[PDB]
Ligand binder design. Structure first.
Ligand SMILES: [Zn+2]
Length: 474
């Protein structure tokens, strides 16, 4: 007999096909059957009439590396219907690195002495021993590797350092990492040459992992950054994932037509993917950058001056008698939200066929960007239902079937017999992001229940206590 059957609802199976009325039966950690299951014995027959049963959402871009360890409930994500998270993005991974004061933006994962894993396997072992509520597909970050190997990061790596980083990268992949990510836009890796990146990532071809990247530049020189990324992809002959695609700065508004055309062209000749979050503001370390600081900027957290959390940087700068750009150094290390994107571009990028959904949430932030709590329902409700940017089955596909395929997460991302029972039950009519910039931690509406490996992790708007997540391998 099945452990339970979610009956009477509409199944959107994650294959980008219109929903159909069907029941979903689960046995253990697997979807046992799909369709009219009235004739199948089940210990429980849960009524989900009026609801949609879809695969659990896979967050293609997270910085939950440490959050998975410190807050196993993973409420910010499971409350949105997320059942799997891809960690170690933008070249930022928790391991391998034993450092009491890791350089920004690595500190976005730190809660105080959090970087205690000398080896990547130690990190994965820790997750398996005390599993989080969601599954985890982990990547190792190039910037973390540089921090672990290089005495001085403000220069290109030497042959010996590249060899040391490549060794760590290979060990990580051998231990279960699903890929390597880079973030050359940031200080720790701004001096890394394209050749350094290629050599450090050589193990990807042997282990069959992916190359993910926060491109070196997403503004005036985004074309050159895109070309570098495509080049690395060809040199490695592995799939590449362009993280949080956008065109930033008023002088680049509307250029998404241009970038998407370049990406579409590259996809015809090589393996290219991309993801994005549904907002016009970004968030990361507070950095001295003319473009990032051109528009409205909010502080998410500040080490030297904790009271600044939540404040407008323009006000802070003005009151200190300096420009936003000049006041940044004295406020570091800190985090911020940057309003430097335009809605039309965000919509164009989200609607672009291949674009996967990634929250890019920064879970440790005192006053976080709302994407941390409302990304997925915002795509399902606001964009799909309310604006009609795409049909619901396509919106679901963009956060389930597509993502599972691109990251190689076998037997997940689809409501199919035999696949793992990562599922979400939501009300298509009411699903919506409740988090706003003003109140960034409000729980989304319309999320009835969430299941991971068959176990309900979210029910009655609360974590059930089921630490059902597993460390996944590609
Ligand atoms: Zn990121």
């Amino acid at each position: 007999p099945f452990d339970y059957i979610l009956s009477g609802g509409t199944v959107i199976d994650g294959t980008n096909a219109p929903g159909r009325l069907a029941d979903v039966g689960v046995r253990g950690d697997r979807i046992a059957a799909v369709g009219d299951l009235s004739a199948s014995s089940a210990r429980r027959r849960i009524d989900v009439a009026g609801k949609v049963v879809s695969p659990g959402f896979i967050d293609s871009h997270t910085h939950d590396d440490n959050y998975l360890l410190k807050h196993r409930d993973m409420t910010p994500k499971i409350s949105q219907g997320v059942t799997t998270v891809v960690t170690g993005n933008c070249g930022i991974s928790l391991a391998p690195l034993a450092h009491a004061n890791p350089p920004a933006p690595l500190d976005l994962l730190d809660e105080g002495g959090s970087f205690r894993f000398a080896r990547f396997s130690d990190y994965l072992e820790a997750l398996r021993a005390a599993p989080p509520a969601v599954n985890a597909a982990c990547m190792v970050g190039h910037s973390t590797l540089r921090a672990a190997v290089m005495p001085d990061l403000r220069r290109e790596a030497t042959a010996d350092e590249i060899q040391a980083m490549q060794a760590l990268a290979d060990d990580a992949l051998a231990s279960g990492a699903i890929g390597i990510s880079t973030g050359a836009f940031y200080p720790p890796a701004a001096h890394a040459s394209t050749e350094e990146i290629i050599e450090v990532c050589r193990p990807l071809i042997t282990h069959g992992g992916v190359y993910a990247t926060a491109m070196r530049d997403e503004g005036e020189h985004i074309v050159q950054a895109l070309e570098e990324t495509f080049r690395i992809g060809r040199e490695l002959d592995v799939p590449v994932v362009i993280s949080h695609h956008k065109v930033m700065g008023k002088l680049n508004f509307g250029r998404s037509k241009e970038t998407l055309a370049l990406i579409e062209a590259a996809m015809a000749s090589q393996d290219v993917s991309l993801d994005a979050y549904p907002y016009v503001a970004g968030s990361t370390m507070l950095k001295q950058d003319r473009v990032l600081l051109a528009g409205r900027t909010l502080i998410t957290w500040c080490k030297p001056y904790p009271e600044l959390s939540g404040r407008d940087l323009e006000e802070i700068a003005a009151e200190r008698g300096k420009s936003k750009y000049d006041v940044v150094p004295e406020l570091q290390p800190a985090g911020a939200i940057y309003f430097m994107m335009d809605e039309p571009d965000v919509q164009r990028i989200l609607a672009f066929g291949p674009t996967m959904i990634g929250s890019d949430g920064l879970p440790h932030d005192e006053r976080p960007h709302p994407r941390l709590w409302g990304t997925f329902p915002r795509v399902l409700g606001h964009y799909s239902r309310d604006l009609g940017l795409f049909p619901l089955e396509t919106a679901v596909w963009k956060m389930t079937g597509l993502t599972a395929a691109k990251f190689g997460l076998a037997e997940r991302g689809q409501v199919q017999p035999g696949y793992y029972a990562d599922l979400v039950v939501f009300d298509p009519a009411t699903v919506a992001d409740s988090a706003t910039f003003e109140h960034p931690t409000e729980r989304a509406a319309g999320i009835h229940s969430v299941y991971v490996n068959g176990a309900a992790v979210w029910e009655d708007q609360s974590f059930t206590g089921q630490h059902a997540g597993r460390v996944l391998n590609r």
